[PDB]
Amino acid sequence: KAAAIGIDLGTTYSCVGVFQKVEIIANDQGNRTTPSYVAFTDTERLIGDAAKNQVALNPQNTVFDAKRLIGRKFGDPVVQSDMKHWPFQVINDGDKPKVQVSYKGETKAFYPEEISSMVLTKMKEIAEAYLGYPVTNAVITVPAYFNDSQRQATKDAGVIAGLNVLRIINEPTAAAIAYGLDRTGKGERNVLIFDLGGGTFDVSILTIDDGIFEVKATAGDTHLGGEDFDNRLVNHFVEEFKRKHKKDISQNKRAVRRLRTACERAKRTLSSSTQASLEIDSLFEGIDFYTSITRARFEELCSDLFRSTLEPVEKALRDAKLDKAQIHDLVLVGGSTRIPKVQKLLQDFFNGRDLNKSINPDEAVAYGAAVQAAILIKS
Numbered sequence: 001k002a003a004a005i006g007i008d009l010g011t012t013y014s015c016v017g018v019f020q021k022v023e024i025i026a027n028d029q030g031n032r033t034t035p036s037y038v039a040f041t042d043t044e045r046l047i048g049d050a051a052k053n054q055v056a057l058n059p060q061n062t063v064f065d066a067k068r069l070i071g072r073k074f075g076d077p078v079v080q081s082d083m084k085h086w087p088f089q090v091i092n093d094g095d096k097p098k099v100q101v102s103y104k105g106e107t108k109a110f111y112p113e114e115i116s117s118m119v120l121t122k123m124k125e126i127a128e129a130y131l132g133y134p135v136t137n138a139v140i141t142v143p144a145y146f147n148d149s150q151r152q153a154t155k156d157a158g159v160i161a162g163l164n165v166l167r168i169i170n171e172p173t174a175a176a177i178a179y180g181l182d183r184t185g186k187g188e189r190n191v192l193i194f195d196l197g198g199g200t201f202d203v204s205i206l207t208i209d210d211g212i213f214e215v216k217a218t219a220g221d222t223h224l225g226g227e228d229f230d231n232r233l234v235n236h237f238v239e240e241f242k243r244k245h246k247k248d249i250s251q252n253k254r255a256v257r258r259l260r261t262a263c264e265r266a267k268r269t270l271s272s273s274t275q276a277s278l279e280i281d282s283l284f285e286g287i288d289f290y291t292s293i294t295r296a297r298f299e300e301l302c303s304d305l306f307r308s309t310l311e312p313v314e315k316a317l318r319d320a321k322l323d324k325a326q327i328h329d330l331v332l333v334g335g336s337t338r339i340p341k342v343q344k345l346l347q348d349f350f351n352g353r354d355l356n357k358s359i360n361p362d363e364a365v366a367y368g369a370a371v372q373a374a375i376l377i378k379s
């Protein structure tokens with residue numbers, strides 16, 4: 001009744017927080033972020049880690065990227081383009097996309113908001129296990145570029161999940177609230193949010209004038225994120241396996257998916273150490289894949305992708321009509337900002353200035369959404 005949660009409903013990962021400072025809630029697996037994945041099996045519906053974990057064995061019925069579909073028409077160019085690359089089926093029901101899956105031996109179709117509602121239900125349950133009581137008040141975040149239809153469908157996913165959605169707020173706004181950047185006093189505060197997540201890259205320039213938020217500019221690449229760096233590691237390893245065993249593994253989907261899972265793990269380790277070891281038992285034709293990679297080789301494999309994050313920053317400043325020196329704060333959002341080379345590129349681009357990464361980048365949005373939920377529920 002007097003409690004409220006903040007939920008970052010992300011494209012690839014979701015996060016839930018409660019202001020108590022903010023407490024970001026760890027899930028049953030102990031993770032502070034949860035995959036935005038829903039898997040339909042012969043016996044049940046799996047949400048989060050359990051869904052992401054069995055993707056190699058059930059790709060057709062493991063749904064992710066519902067956020068790319070939510071609030072869009074089926075005939076939308078983005079939907080038609082995205083459909084080609086997903087292993088699950090997207091169908092047309094009255095010009096609204098639905099994901100069609102096999103669930104308990106039968107064909108079933110779900111609206112993007114229904115799928116999102118299952119991720120939201122998991123986030124709500126995670127919060128409930130932490131607080132020891134039912135909680136329904138929540139603030140859910142969306143990208144600043146989301147249109148009214150996308151915001152309404154996101155809100156609908158909240159209602160389907162049993163949540164009272166206090167407000168739908170922009171992700172870069174939530175990240176600025178997490179750092180208290182709306183509480184610095186009278187006058188204009190210019191904030192740049194650099195968000196590099198699992199699958200998308202968003203740059204936002206915000207102006208906070210006497211506590212009031214204005215989005216002056218948005219730029220980025222909707223199709224650039226953590227998964228592209230995992231794939232550069234996949235390509236490198238496929239090439240390594242070819243040189244070591246004279247065999248191409250590319251056409252064996254299970255082997256590729258397994259290698260990609262190991263690559264995402266090695267990438268995360270490389271943010272905190274200078275070397276990482278891949279330990280894959282029987283990757284292809286009964287051959288084990290035990291190898292290592294250095295932070296330096298990883299930076300080289302992703303160099304062009306890391307560098308391409310700077311052009312949208314330049315375009316956002318241009319559109320905001322602001323120079324680098326006019327930006328008061330530089331805020332890192334998204335799990336991929338954890339990469340030291342990404343941080344170095346943005347710091348060098350901002351003439352050696354400090355970057356805000358004190359709050360875990362993949363938690364800053366839910367942190368901010370929880371602060372906003374606490375303000376709305378108290379008032």
Ligand SMILES: Nc1ncnc2c1nc(NCc1ccc3ncccc3c1)n2[C@@H]1O[C@H](CO)[C@@H](O)[C@H]1O
Nearest residue numbers: 013197198226227264267268271335336338339362
């Ligand atoms: N230390 C890092 N170094 C480079 N990248 C990183 C990263 N920690 C994360 N995410 C946080 C995360 C994601 C999954 C996890 N599973 C298990 C345990 C911790 C986990 C933490 N990322 C990437 O951010 C995106 C959204 O999570 C994904 O592409 C993820 O690979």
Ligand SMILES: [Cl-]
Nearest residue numbers: 271272273274
């Ligand atoms: Cl380090």
